């Protein structure tokens, strides 16, 4: 059984980063070489593993997280980073073992007038824990008085639209991101490769 990486990298819709998708990859052969040796990827950074040797490795499970962010935000999808994406949307742990893979998707994820469907969490009182996924839409209280779910001054919907336009500078353009995290237990290794 080949690992279904095609379902992940070649999916048609990608999630908003605040509602990032996770795909559990198990009981399959993972050919990571078809990926690292491809021209498709502007980012391919691995941590706790060498990207070349991936195909010699077995793992207990592999998770593939995916979402869209700005090109100048890909730098935040790494251990030790801070910013609106790392703090409030998708957080990698300090001891992350896996790979971060991104490519420019301006062709599919932009629209002439501005694509506004992709969102990120702008307001949150405290930082996300690693691999925490917050889908709350609770109106955010920025002032002294409770909002009780009504929008207004100091009372803000917590999610913000990216607004991707094809003529954006490259930092403002959308990038699709796949995060492979390599899980290891004292358990059977179900994802090995070649």
């Amino acid at each position, epitope marked *: 059984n080949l690992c279904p990486f095609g379902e992940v990298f070649n999916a048609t819709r990608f999630a908003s980063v605040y509602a990032w998708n996770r795909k559990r990859i198990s009981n399959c052969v993972a050919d990571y070489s078809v990926l690292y040796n491809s021209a498709s990827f502007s980012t391919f950074k691995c941590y706790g593993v060498s990207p070349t040797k991936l195909n010699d490795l077995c793992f207990t499970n592999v998770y593939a997280d995916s979402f869209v962010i700005r090109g100048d935000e890909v730098r935040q999808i790494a251990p030790g980073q801070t910013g609106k994406i790392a*703090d409030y949307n998708y957080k990698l742990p300090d001891d992350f073992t896996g790979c971060v893979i991104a490519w420019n998707s301006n062709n599919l994820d932009s629209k002439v007038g*501005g694509n506004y469907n992709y969102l990120y969490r702008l307001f949150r009182k405290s930082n996300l824990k690693p691999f925490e996924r917050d889908i709350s839409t609770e109106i955010y209280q920025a002032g*002294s008085t409770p909002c009780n779910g009504v929008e207004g001054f100091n009372c803000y919907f917590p999610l913000q639209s990216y607004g991707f336009q094809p*003529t954006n*500078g490259v930092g*403002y353009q959308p990038y699709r991101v796949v995060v492979l995290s390599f899980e290891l237990l004292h358990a059977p290794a179900t994802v090995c490769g070649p």
Partner: antibody, heavy 118, light 108 residues
Framework: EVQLVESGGGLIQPGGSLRLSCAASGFIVSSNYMSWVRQAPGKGLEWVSIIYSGGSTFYADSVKGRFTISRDNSKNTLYLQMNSLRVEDTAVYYC????????????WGQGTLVTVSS | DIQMTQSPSSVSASVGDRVTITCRASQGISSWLAWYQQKPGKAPKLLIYAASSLQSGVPSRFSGSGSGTDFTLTISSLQPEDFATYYCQEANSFPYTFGQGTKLEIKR
């Protein structure tokens, strides 16, 4: 209503240190993005620093490693600690509540003047 | 970084005129642009956020427009208290660069 009052400006020699304060009413400083913006005499405006509700901090390149932004939730007050001051830090310093790209800098204090001179 | 160019530096007008001020960003920033007004010895005041949204309390003769690289502030019929300096600002990437400002002064 809602207010922002800066204080702590004054005369300091190059190499000196200074802390500015920004006391807020209405806004909860710890729940907002808060930024400091400065204006050298006769010049335009320059964003210098921002603090996130969750605690992350960021800095313009001209002040990185010398200035520190912080807050005291209990006093609803924002701070900018300014170390290793230079002549070119001479400016009126404004604190502002920051709504990022949602609503930009919608409330500013009156500003406090820092003069760095020998 | 992104450069924000305001031109001209100075605009001459009379009360009642239609005034338009432009701001150009060096790369496409969609609609993430703010306009501020400032008077001598006073803090800046926000007029327009997100390129075209009018800030609460700001007279409706003020409007913003544009998307991408070229943005405009328009005052539909000038009033005496409108003579001031105007600044645009990149709102959605560090270091939140302000334009160099356009001064609105009285024609005679």
């Amino acid at each position: 209503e809602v207010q922002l009052v800066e204080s702590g400006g004054g005369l300091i020699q190059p190499g000196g240190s200074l802390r500015l304060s920004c006391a807020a009413s209405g806004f909860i400083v710890s729940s907002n993005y808060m930024s400091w913006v400065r204006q050298a005499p006769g010049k335009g405006l320059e964003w210098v620093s921002i603090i996130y509700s969750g605690g992350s901090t960021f800095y313009a390149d001209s002040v990185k490693g010398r200035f520190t932004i912080s807050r005291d939730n209990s006093k609803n007050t924002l701070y900018l600690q300014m170390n290793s001051l230079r002549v070119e830090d001479t400016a009126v310093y404004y604190c502002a509540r920051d709504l990022q790209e949602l609503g930009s800098l919608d409330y500013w204090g009156q500003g406090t003047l820092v003069t760095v001179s020998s | 970084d992104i450069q924000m160019t305001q031109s001209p530096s100075s605009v001459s007008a009379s009360v009642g005129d239609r005034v338009t001020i432009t701001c150009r960003a060096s790369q496409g920033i969609s609609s993430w642009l703010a306009w501020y007004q400032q008077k001598p010895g006073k803090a800046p005041k926000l007029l327009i956020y997100a390129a075209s949204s009018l800030q609460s309390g700001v007279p409706s003769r003020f409007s913003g427009s544009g998307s991408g690289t070229d943005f405009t502030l328009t005052i539909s019929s000038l009033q005496p208290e409108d003579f001031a300096t105007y600044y645009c600002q990149e709102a959605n990437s560090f270091p939140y660069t302000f334009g160099q400002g356009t001064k609105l002064e009285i024609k005679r």
